[PDB]
Subunit: 270 residues, 5 copies
């Protein structure tokens, strides 16, 4: 960030690893939303709290570094690398748990399918969010938070980029995926990675391995610096929809994300 | 360009970064076109101004250089670029045509899409090519015309007579203008089109990705008149409305983060 | 959590082991029995013979303040019998209104293998917490025998070791990314109703099992742990229009070297 | 070719770049074929001249080389920047396409089976005969695989060396009966990709930042015999599906070439 | 593999290149099978000879090396590299040759589509085949060869891996693709490469170029050593099915494969 970055402290107990998971927040806590609803044209677009998928977020507490915050050089934890995994991909190989049945009702149940998003960020502070949504008029129930101008309104500009609509991902299960994307004009002290696929019946493609590592160092060899000795993890893994037999109703299906972050002590001015 | 390129000036205040965004121009300003129309066979192909998606374009003003013993020009070295609001499409409740015979959720944006951006030291060079030479574009849109005002059958293939400079936002339709590969020496452009009726869009986003703008000889776009030229075209697909079963083009904005350095040139 | 020393690097210091794991899709001859779907509000209690499981085996390897353990360095692995799917005459649901050939295997599929120095660590996660697995299958249970709603997401209480072939259902158990320090695992799932399988085969491909520090899986008790899950898709039978899981076998060729460790 | 290749001449005026385009030859000249026809079973397979897509080809004239009294020099094609022009033309759902969502939606963008292919060569591209239906009747002036006697037997559906030709005329050799001959083309570099299916979506990229090296395993590029550069193209993006008629038309796209050549010394 | 490999002989006439093609063997010789048939449930699965696609195979005769077979060091040809191409991909851009017509009969004919396999091997001996098939009970007409135990039977194990079912690809147009895969437990002296795609109407994707070369040398820099001065080529290129208009019957469509192999003389202990 806008800190002056100095030498990497090295030695034993200059590096630590944190293991964490984020369970999905698809509108309920057990990995499925309630049924997806669609207001009739000309009616209010006011979906149920429990059908709006949100970003998962957590701040992990790191070991205290500076006894005096007033020393003229500080130590901050620097996130160097992350091993991350989407847990329970194998759970989707299930054609018997009440899925809409293929081949005119004689086949097995539909495995999870439809539009999906997979996304994670590691950061030294809350992730910066830019407001952008499909329908400016959408009404999010409390306690969810959506793009608002200072006056409380939400005009047509919220369907494109208007800098007036910004927020910090500072609470789990609160910021809907559908009205908030990572702000590419900020997040200097965060690394984020996302992939969205659309379509009605699109098959999800997900891989898993313990052999994959992502470097979090930027073009200048600096990783996220954890302000207040706090590591900020964010997740969004909506694998697709579950299509229920007989009802033919659709439910968002979320998956949890494992994190394994490596950090090292780093010196900064002030 | 047709300038003689010399040494990279280095020192304090020899590099700068510019941040910009281009909002989409899909025919209106709030990211959706009006309904897509299709003339009956034998009728004029004359679509509405507000249903024709166009290239977004802007010229960013750079610091003045040769105010103050060699000639200097800004050289665009790299760009971090992002399509903003991809997450907006994970929305199955905002009036989309409903799946599984009307009992399921609304269709997320789908269909044919184009994603494209250019960084340049001058206006982007456009070659005329369109699906239907007879198409009638309402004013103020601009489409391929010969000098006499006509548009013959050759405009469906390559005819060098049909050329233009992308010199105005929301004006040049994506469907009749492509980047001219015979020119654009002083511009770097990147585009991907996918077709199909219900094709799912696939879009990624990260702040960890950089594109080098230097050519085979280590030279980036040189900003003539101290002006950086950005262009965008991000039509994510169509929105399919429930009940009407009408289709609307859906555009997305594009963030740019360009790094430039001072470069010396002879005339 | 061992202290790893020098690679012993002399005569009789390397060996290669060949093995195959046949699939465990619910029966032993590469097809499950018909996939069943309880009516809404009825118990989700599928047949033993319709639940695909992880294949697993422990290969026995050759038999002081410094010890020698076998270190798995590399693996050549292959999914055998991919060519078996080019078959449009063996009773498949027929295309083009019954006049065409039978459907080749299609639908949702998973391909997965692990090489390890100990049993593969499994985390419990399933689509439906209420699912009832017949004996002798094992599914996520708390210590008290219950299985609450948390088993649809990550709850650390639901863990197991892949210590028996044809026993742990693919659908309620994934590799635990919080453990498996001494195992290398690789998996790819594709969903969809009629999704075409895409599978490649060659004897020219090798996977390195060494980690970021050049250490491979260390075989505790002189035992190499292999695991497999290759559900190619479903077979769609003509007339019945019923679906059967189709499994494929996996060949392993592992190279190991002697490695020195403290204790 | 069967020349002995020597040193790369370097100096002033030892390299040049040529710009060219090939417009598509899908059966007419304005980027669409006439309607695709399908004979009834048992009837002759005799499609219209104007519904058979062909290879585009051109020979560009290079500067004359052996004229100075001071080794003999041929132009060597080193690299090519190539682009499919007018990909953006396909983002069009208003020009009479079969309409989606039961007639209330927009027109179908181009879709279906497609082929994208280009070659750079020092001589005409070598073609091997292979076709789906040996009995197909190509109208004059099109050329299809024939034995010396004029016949075309069942072997033309697989590889029979008897069926060979040189791509020596634009808009003449149908894509469907001629592929690049991998047993020849020593002095040509070719690159092709075909995708099938009824409604398959075309995926096409465009950029001015991409270069293809034309040098072989021995660092030799195509050597332009008679000071002539041979370009070939085949860009059938897919079909246009017309509303109401529900008839299909092949849609071709033009291909830009930017070739870099250098002088190269050869012995007889 | 199995020979003591010594120095690479170098000199004039120490390298040679062979050009060959394998025409497809989809059940007839002109690139199409007869109609695909499907026995009714409970009836014998006994398809026609001319509807079963098989591996193409050929042994190319190489120049004689050893005048005395009794010399204590021999020369064998070593296959170093291969340029290989699937010929006639462009043949599929054909919507007028009697294909089932799109858009309710008013459109053009279906181009070849459906499940496909592309595969080639270069070897110093016949390719090793492992028996595995979808239906153990399938009855292959003479002269085709399918997995049999020594006693003549074919039990349920032939649907998975049973080492008892092995064969050498020693005859063209004889070993069905559907019951035989390359044996990964053998083929030490062969290099093989295969890709299968399934589905009913799956579009084939095939590329062609004269600029692509595959190295055949193993992890120890040894290529296939041609026993008896014979190079073994194998091919399987079933591009998909042809769907005929009116009949709505399906025919396997095969394509030929070009080979260009480079070999060098190599010394071995004897
Ligand atoms: Cl609207
Ligand atoms: Cl079908
Ligand atoms: Cl469920
Ligand atoms: Cl895999
Ligand atoms: Cl069965
Ligand atoms: Cl016929
Ligand atoms: Cl290409
Ligand atoms: Cl290329
Ligand atoms: Cl037309
Ligand atoms: Cl030949
Ligand atoms: Cl035919
Ligand atoms: Cl291949
Ligand atoms: Cl036929």
């Amino acid at each position: 960030g806008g800190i002056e970055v100095l030498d990497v402290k090295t030695g034993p107990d200059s590096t630590t690893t944190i293991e964490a998971y984020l369970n999905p927040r698809v509108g309920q806590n057990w990995g499925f939303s309630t049924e997806i609803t669609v207001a009739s044209n000309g009616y209010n677009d006011a979906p149920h709290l429990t059908e709006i998928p949100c970003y998962s977020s957590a701040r992990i507490s790191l070991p205290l570094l500076n006894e005096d915050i007033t020393s003229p050089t500080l130590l901050m934890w620097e996130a160097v690398s992350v091993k991350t995994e989407v847990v329970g991909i194998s759970s989707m190989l299930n054609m018997h748990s009440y899925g809409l049945r293929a081949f005119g009702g004689y086949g097995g149940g539909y495995t999870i399918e439809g539009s999906h998003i997979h996304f994670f960020s590691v950061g030294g502070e809350p992730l910066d969010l830019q407001g952008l949504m499909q329908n400016h008029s959408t009404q999010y129930p409390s306690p969810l938070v959506g793009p608002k101008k200072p006056d409380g309104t939400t005009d047509d500009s919220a369907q494109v980029l208007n800098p007036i609509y910004k927020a910090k991902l500072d609470k789990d299960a609160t910021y809907p995926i559908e009205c908030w994307c990572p702000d590419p004009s900020r997040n200097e002290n965060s690394r984020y990675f996302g992939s969205y696929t659309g379509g009605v019946e699109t098959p999800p493609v997900l891989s898993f391995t313990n052999t994959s590592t992502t470097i979090l160092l930027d073009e200048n060899g600096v990783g996220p610096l954890c302000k207040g000795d706090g590591l900020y993890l964010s997740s969004a893994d909506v694998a697709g929809t579950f299509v229920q037999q007989t009802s033919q109703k659709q439910y968002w299906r979320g998956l949890p994300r494992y994190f394994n972050i490596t950090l090292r002590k780093r010196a900064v001015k002030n």
